[PDB]
Amino acid sequence: RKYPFLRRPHIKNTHSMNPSAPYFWSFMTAKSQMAFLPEENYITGDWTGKFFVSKRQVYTLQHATSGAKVRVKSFPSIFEFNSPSRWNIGKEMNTLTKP
Amino acid sequence: NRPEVAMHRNTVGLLPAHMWETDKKTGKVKSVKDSVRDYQTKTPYPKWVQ
Amino acid sequence: FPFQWKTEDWYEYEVAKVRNRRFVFENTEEDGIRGSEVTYKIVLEGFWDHH
Amino acid sequence: VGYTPVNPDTSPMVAYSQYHWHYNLPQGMERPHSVNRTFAA
Amino acid sequence: DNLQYKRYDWQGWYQRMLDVHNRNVSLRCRICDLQRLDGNGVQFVDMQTERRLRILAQHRVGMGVLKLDADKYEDQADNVTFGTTKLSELLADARKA
Amino acid sequence: NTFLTSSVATPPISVIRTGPKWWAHPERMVRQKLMYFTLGVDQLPLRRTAVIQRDLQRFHMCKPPPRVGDSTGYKRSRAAQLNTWYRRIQYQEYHMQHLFTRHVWGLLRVYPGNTTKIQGKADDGYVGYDSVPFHRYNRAPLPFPARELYERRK
Amino acid sequence: YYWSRYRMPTQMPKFDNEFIDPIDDKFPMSIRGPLVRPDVPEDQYVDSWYICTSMTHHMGDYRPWSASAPPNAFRFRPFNEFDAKGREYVQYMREFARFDPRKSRGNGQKGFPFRDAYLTKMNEANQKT
Amino acid sequence: NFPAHFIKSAFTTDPLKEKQKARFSSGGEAMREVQDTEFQALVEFIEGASYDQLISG
Amino acid sequence: GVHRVGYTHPSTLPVPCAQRWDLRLARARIFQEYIEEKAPGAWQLEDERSMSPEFKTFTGYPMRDMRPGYGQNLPDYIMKKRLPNNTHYELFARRDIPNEDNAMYGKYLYDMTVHGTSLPSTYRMHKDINKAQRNDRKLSGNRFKVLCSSGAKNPPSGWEPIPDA
Amino acid sequence: VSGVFSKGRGIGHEATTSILRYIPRARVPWQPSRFGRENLTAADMARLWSRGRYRDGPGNYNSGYCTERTHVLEENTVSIIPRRELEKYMPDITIGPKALVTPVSLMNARNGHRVTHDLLHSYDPHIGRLGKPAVVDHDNITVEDPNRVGLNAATLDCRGRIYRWLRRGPFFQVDNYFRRSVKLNRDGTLPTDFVHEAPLMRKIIRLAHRGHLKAACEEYRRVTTVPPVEVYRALTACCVPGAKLADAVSIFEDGDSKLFYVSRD
Amino acid sequence: TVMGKPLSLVLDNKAWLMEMVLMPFDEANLDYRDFDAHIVSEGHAMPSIANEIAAFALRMAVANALVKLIPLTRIPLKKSGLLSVDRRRERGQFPGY
Amino acid sequence: QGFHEKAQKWREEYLLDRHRALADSLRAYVEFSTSKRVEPWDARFKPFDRIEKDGVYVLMRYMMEEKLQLCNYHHRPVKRLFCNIGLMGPQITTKARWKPYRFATNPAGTSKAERMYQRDKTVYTHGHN
Amino acid sequence: MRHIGQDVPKRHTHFVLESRLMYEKSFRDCWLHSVCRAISQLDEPLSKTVVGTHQKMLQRKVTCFQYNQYGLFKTPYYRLANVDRYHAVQGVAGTREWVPYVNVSYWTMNKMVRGGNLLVHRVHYTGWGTDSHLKKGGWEHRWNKVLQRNVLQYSRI
RNA sequence: UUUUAUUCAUAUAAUUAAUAGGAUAAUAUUUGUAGUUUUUGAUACCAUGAUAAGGAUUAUAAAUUGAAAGUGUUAAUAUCAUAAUCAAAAUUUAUUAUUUAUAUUAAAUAUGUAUGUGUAGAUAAAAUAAGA
Secondary structure, X not given: OOOOOOOOOOOOOOOOOOOOOOOOOOOOOOOOOOOOOOHHHOEXXXXXXXXXXXXXXXXXXXXXXXXXXXXXXXXXXXXXXXXXXOOOOOOEHHHHOOO | OOOOOOXXXXXXXXXXXXXXXXXXXXXXXXXXXXXXXXXXXXOOOOOOOO | OOOOOOHHHHHHHHHHHHHOOOOOOOOOXXXXXXXXXXXXXXXXXXXXXOO | OOOOOOXXXXXXXXXXOOOOOOOOOOOOOOOOOOOOOOOOO | OOOOOOOOOHHHHHHHXXXXXXXXXXXXXXXXXXXXXOOOOOEXXXXXXXXXXXXXXXXXXXXXXXXXXXXOOOOHHHHHHHHHHHHHHHHHHHOOO | OOOOOOOOXXXXXXXXXXXXXXXXXXXXXXXXXXXXHHOOOOOHHHHHHHHXXXXXXXXXXXXXXXOOOOOOOOHHHHHHHHHHHHHHHHHXXXXXXXXXXXXXXXXXXXXXXXXXXOOOOOOOOEOOOOOOXXXXXXXXXXXXXXXXXXXXXX | XXXXXXXXXXXXXXXXXXXXXXXXXXXXXXXXXXXXXXXOOHHXXXXXXXXXXXXXXXXXXXXXXXXXXOOOOHHHOOOOOOOHHHHHHHHHHHHHHOOOHHHHOOXXXXXXXXXXXXXXXXXXXXXXX | OOOOOOOXXXXXXXXXXXXHHHHHOOHHHHHHHOOOHHHHHHHHHHHHXXXXXXXXX | OOOOOOOOOOOOOOOOOOOHHHHHHHHHHHHOOOXXXXXXXXXXXXXXXXXXXXXOOOOOOOOOOOOOOOOOOOHHHHHHOOOOOOOHHHHHHHHOOOOHHHOXXXXXXXXXXXOOOOXXXXXXXXXXXXXXXXXXXXXXXXXXXXXXXXHHHOOOOOOOOOOOO | OEEEEOOOOXXXXXXXXXXXXXXXXXXXXXXXXXXXXXXXXXXXHHHHHHHHOOOOOOOXXXXXXXXXXXXXXXXXXXXXXXXHHHHHHOOEOOOOHHHOEOOHHHOOXXXXXXXXXXXXXXXXXXOOOEOEOOOOOOOOOOOOXXXXXXXXXXXXXXXXXXXXXXXXXXXXXXXXXXXXHOOOOOXXXXXXXXXXXXXXXXXXXHHHHHOOHHHHHHHHHOOOOOOOHHHHHHHHHHHOOOOOHHHHHHHHHHHHOOOOOOOOO | OEOOEOHHHHOOOOHHHHHHHHHXXXXXXXXXXXXXXXXXXXXXXXXXXXXXXXXXXXXXXXXXXXXXXXXXXXXXXXXXXXXXXXXOOOOOOOOOO | OOHHHHHHHHHHHHHHHHHHHHHHHHHHHHHHHHOOEOOOOXXXXXXXXXXXXXXXXXXXXHHOHHHHHHHOOOHHHHXXXXXXHOOOOXXXXXXXXXXXXXXXXXXXXXXXXXXXXXXXXXXXXXXXO | OOOOOOOOOOHHHHHHHHHHHHHHHHHHHHHHHHXXXXXXXXXXXXXXXXXXXXXXXXXXXXXXXXXXXXOXXXXXXXXXXXXXXXXXXXXXXOOOOEEOOOXXXXXXXXXXXXXXXXXXXXXXOOOOOOOHHHHOOOHHHHHHHHHHHHOOOOOOO
């Protein structure tokens, strides 16, 4: 079975490999670093509580500074980003899962 | 710098070389110390905001 | 004869001939077949050619 | 055939069957219908 | 339409789609027709005025015919007045020579 | 030359069987004739294979004559003899082409492809910048400045 | 009912691999002719839908080739003097023989002359013969 | 299972329909509205060479 | 090569004339054309595959922008693109209805006009007839799945179902 | 009994039902008992509406407004992170209901729409109607949607609503909105006394009397209500000096045949 | 001359391709340097038509032109099979293969 | 049973290892960039063929030696410098021959073709040591 | 509600009906989203009137409004699922599974062709067809010709 | 005593009944049309159609550039007319025809692991603008 280029019906088939040092920014992220963060980083309306943050949200300093728990959906039921660090800043959550 | 047009212009000064403990014999990075602990920042948000 | 031309002139002629198709003034003052006041073009569309 | 009924407007089978007009014919107007002038509302 | 998009509800929006698709209006004007004396007593467009007009309309002029195709508005009634307005602007700027 | 990657080898029968596509390609044959002429030697085997290929390609469309009329005792043996004789002439031409290409490479300081032998200055197959660190068929390790076959100047 | 329209019955005809009639199909080709339909102009045939044959838009009533060409036409050409390409290139030469650039104004592609002769006239190397 | 088509012409006509059919269509109405064996076989065979016929076995 | 494009004013010119840059500015003002400032001068790539008559695909118009880094995200593409309003998308969104006889007229209105009551679907009718045959044969094994159970759990006063056997 | 809903309530008034019960009603022959979306209770309707927009709306558990403190998945229940903890690392940029609604002049550019909601809010009282006629209020546009005026394809009677919405004529939304918002008063007076546009009318009058006909027309482009006859009078008066007969006739016709013959003065 | 360019440049100075164009003037027992010939391309235009099939098409066109010009040249060319078209055609596109 | 917890702990350990791996990879990339490479030109073809005391080599050693030393013989800046100087002309891409990518990305002194396979494999740097 | 009364043999046929809503919302929200994205992403000055910090603040306000637009349809069209309206069969656009003009799956199209339900003209299964644009370049050439007819023939004043 | 090739990659998650028209029309607040509640085959079963594999043979000689691809059945599969308890969004999950050595990540998130002298067994394909 073959499908049109860059139009694979599978959306989660993309396996984000180990981050590459030489680029580390022009891979799985925004093409330009002068662009604004996606909508997942912000709150649109008065919610009653988010179950888990999506994997498209970029990682910021406030994630490790605030201390609030963050979790994403993976092969298991859920994965919480325990022991927050500062090395993963400016990267989306999909690059730190290894499905 | 990415290796597209300018890569030889990279210098060791850009490399922090202080947030990790490196092998004094080979030169590879052995371990990395914690970074969020007692982090020093003048402004977590851009200065012009608020 | 025989016809020998240059590539730049040939390219320019071909492009100009392709471009200048809708730049036709239908209603002129010429006598004969061409030259009139109003022009109506009725396009009939069908499933079959003989229809 | 089937729960979904066939469309009599765009189906070539019903359009060119014995009970309708084939495509190898003059394709003229069948009848000059006049409704609004015979009885307007 | 007269085949299957009449006498029913979808006929209205099908006709609106047809009108929006055919909203284009093409206005054609000849330079030889422009080259006439005006009310003031001078030629409306001279050689320099024609050259300036041809430069201003890079591809809108062709075979000596100035053609402007307006698709600006959904209806031909507004496309025609937009085309006339733009042609008037172009003529006013071209007469500057 | 400009082609320096790894190459596979094919039997001469395959290239001979390839007709007016590679082996009998007129442009390639003209290049071989020029190579012989600039060296000032006769092109007798090249002309022999040229006329053989011309005769074969002219009548390749025509159907073969009825084999029943032909005598299997003698006519088939004669046809096999002629075919083998033509094939041997083409083999000789192929060998001459390869030999003279190697010789001209050696004279012109042209570095051949990997595992290619140039008699007089390589004698074992020159290999350079290959996918495998070791020399194929020899198992000799290869340096990074692969091999300076010729003198530096010019 | 609506379905009452689709109830007219057709009466059976009165007599006295698959799909092929052996008698007509096995007839010799050199005698029957390599033809599966009357040799009338192809404009009279339309590829039938849902059937692997070609029927005529006029039911029967075949018209011969001489019914489309002028009387006593050569090879059924519209004009006996030239073929299609002759009629095209002679026309091109004739119109170029009286082409004038001033006349090209107003109309569109019709103003462009015969390119083969126009460009060869515009080529300086062709001036010296 | 299989619908009854009744290809027989005697199984699809009844007197009630024939009564109304006869008035509109009858012999008089139809007349009003309408207007050497070897040699014959040979000419029949060779007439297939016409521009609107084919040679048939 | 690298250089600075020079401009000469008509007043500074020995003989005044209308400069091509001034004419370009006037044309841009007339036609409301956006002047791209960061357009490199060394990228005048002709779409030869659509402009050369020597190619099969010649059309006389440039069919490509000849920019590898071109996408729908950039504002230039956004400004020069075409909206899908009143397009084939809009035609399909109203014509490709799963039930064809619902874009012309409402089923209930059509039934109430042509017929006297709203007819059910063919599948619904077949299910009803099959239920009739099953009830005639066995009259057992059926459930009582309903939308609102209030009327079944609290039957109206004066309702007495007659037994079967 | 396998009843989907345990409870149901009527919609007709108690004053009229008790008298109308004596008149037999012609029910649908193949389905006499009809249990529509209106007959559902308040809680059942809220649950059904919340479940309806499971793809894009708050129907998905993680989307929001789920009102559930724990989610059971993969045989492992997970607690919910509250909004107070979420906003620590998600900076809130909430504007409120004022953001979803676009101005009236953007209706044509948004294909006959004003509200930027998850569901298409029809302006006719027949698609988003639930017992009462459908009325869309732009000052109360919220995700909870106390009035079920939106259009979704996962409710009890969604199929007919979708069919009606897709089977709509041109200018359907604009016509419905204009007809419902603007109409002649019962007193017979023109609807030209609104306060939300009176300063704009005065501004246009001042521009016309100063002679700025282009500015007056540009401001008139943005009006939503029927202008008073003074606006047309001033526009025509300011067109008089310029001999702009075409403009005068156009501004006369824009109010003569289109807006309750206000310009008929 | 082919498409306004010399035959040697059109065929990239390939003898085995130009001899096919020359052949009709030998089979008819004529002189090549007595006639002006022009070739117009009307199929799929390609940057290089230097191939055996294109040379065959050119030879057929020249043979037909010679037959039209001098009727008696029909017999030699027809006997040599220069006006005999071959209906061979490359396989069409198909995802199966 | 317990696979959720096991996978969560495995992913935690994997991310903790990934932080150190990223640090080491960045260090290796910077060191490779700042370290001098080998001469990225084929010494077997016309331009870069002559003796070290004649031809292009004297020009290199008396004109562009400082720039080559600053660029550390990386192939891209070396080629760009040779194009910018223009004393060689357009021959860089038409007549000059250069070493392949992974052969010209070797360190300064290798003398062995088995060097690209001996580079560090735990560092994810797309072939940049 | 849940398989009590559905009136249809395939319950998945309602997915087409609900996808029509997606297309309608795209028609509603395409202009607003495009304008917001262009204004937010543009870095060069908008005009002579507004430059610098005013432009930066306007960009941030525009992107804040765009993020606050709840329910705005911003989805690539190729991510939309394509299912035939008659048999609820899913097909991938760009492959033989889907027929673009009929907008039905390959199975539905084959059924309608083998029956008398669509008026199509059979051609050779391994050719280019009657169309000269298809025979003279193929799908891409016919694509370019369609583009030229639709757009690249007007003066565009 | 004849010729060609073959390492092939995602795969399940929860709810589906109605018709209602607007400017330039001699007048309808029908502005804003308000009567809950007796039914039940596929969230998981319709067996029947197509397809795969796939073959047939007359054209003498002259002229002409001409006068030249055709399918049963056996099989497997499946979404259709036929027999109620449940697959399509939270995708790991292993599903045949791929870029091999002068230059290699810029616009929707778009692949870091198999260099090893191209070295088995089996399998498929064609006489088709090519040149057995």
